[PDB]
Amino acid sequence: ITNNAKNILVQFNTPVQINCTRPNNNTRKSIRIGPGQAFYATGDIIGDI
Amino acid sequence: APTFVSVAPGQTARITCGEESLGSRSVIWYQQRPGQAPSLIIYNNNDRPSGIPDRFSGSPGSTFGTTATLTITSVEAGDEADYYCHIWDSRRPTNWVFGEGTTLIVLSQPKAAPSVTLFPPSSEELQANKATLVCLISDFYPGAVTVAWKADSSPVKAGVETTTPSKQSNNKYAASSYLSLTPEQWKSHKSYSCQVTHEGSTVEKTVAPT
């Protein structure tokens, strides 16, 4: 604990809940780029940015 | 530019205005009676201001991919006017020009066929090096304008000016169409004509030099 280089690991007794979201309603677009090979790119985003 | 929608008295109206929605919108609808000032109907979609009947309803701005819509059920005679929409789209920048308005018109009597009369340019005008064809259209209802100038086979797009239709104390409206040409052009083509269509019914009258 006296040496700063080592990290300080902590363990909780009561869980802290966390809510994460990606509000952007993206879409998947599979554009064939090779024989038997398919690349997946993001399409039009529906809704608010 | 204008868009017309015919609605029988006491029936539902469908009004389209604005582009496709890309984000959450806040649509504004306005009422511009003929000659009067634009009056507000709907702000923030279905929500309305004091003194407005419930027959006017706005489509919600929460959905995406659709166009705004002002719904009028059992239209009374007073509701007929020009309606503009002001789009506040989250994805789109600020709009300073309203959308192309929709002209709602109650039928308010039976459809009338246009009465057309075409006159050749005056002989006196040839001396001044000015030639003008006059296509008169009257006794027509509703006030829908369709200008079509055909010089023999092929038409002429430029050099034509037409006014807005207006009623003259009758169901009919007043439409007058003009065309500025040169004296050497009147003797060029064999015969001219101005075709007038109304609600899908075309009327054509020709003219020939002497």
Ligand SMILES: *[C@@H]1O[C@H](CO)[C@@H](O[C@@H]2O[C@H](CO)[C@@H](O[C@@H]3O[C@H](CO[C@H]4O[C@H](CO)[C@@H](O)[C@H](O[C@H]5O[C@H](CO)[C@@H](O)[C@H](O)[C@@H]5O)[C@@H]4O)[C@@H](O)[C@H](O[C@H]4O[C@H](CO)[C@@H](O)[C@H](O)[C@@H]4O[C@H]4O[C@H](CO)[C@@H](O)[C@H](O)[C@@H]4O)[C@@H]3O)[C@H](O)[C@H]2NC(C)=O)[C@H](O)[C@H]1NC(C)=O
């Ligand atoms: C990321 O970048 C990409 C490009 O790299 C963007 O993709 C582009 O997205 C735009 C829209 O934002 C697309 O424009 C749309 O194209 C539609 C398809 O047109 C083609 O096919 C139709 C028939 O199916 C033909 O009529 C067209 O021919 C004409 O257009 C070309 C030019 O593209 C002219 O040169 C020709 O002379 C023809 O005129 C094409 O072949 C097209 O239908 C669509 O049109 C709607 O929107 C226009 C806007 O002016 C209206 O005029 C038109 O009437 C249509 O109106 C829609 O909306 C109204 C309501 O307002 C509805 O009532 C209508 O029913 C309709 O829904 C428009 O032109 C573009 O093609 C596309 N290109 C590519 C390569 O993907 C991404 O959008 C962009 N994304 C992001 C997030 O940034």
Ligand SMILES: *[C@@H]1O[C@H](CO)[C@@H](O[C@@H]2O[C@H](CO)[C@@H](O[C@@H]3O[C@H](CO[C@H]4O[C@H](CO)[C@@H](O)[C@H](O)[C@@H]4O)[C@@H](O)[C@H](O)[C@@H]3O)[C@H](O)[C@H]2NC(C)=O)[C@H](O)[C@H]1NC(C)=O
């Ligand atoms: C993220 O964006 C997605 C679209 O890319 C959203 O998916 C949409 O989800 C709604 C329901 O929440 C679906 O609506 C249903 O559609 C079916 C079938 O539609 C038929 O009728 C409609 C006209 O009403 C017509 O346009 C169609 O072509 C069909 O003829 C209906 O039977 C249901 O009652 C309901 O209306 C959309 O269809 C669906 N979109 C697509 C492209 O599938 C998704 O909901 C968005 N994310 C969130 C969290 O909302």
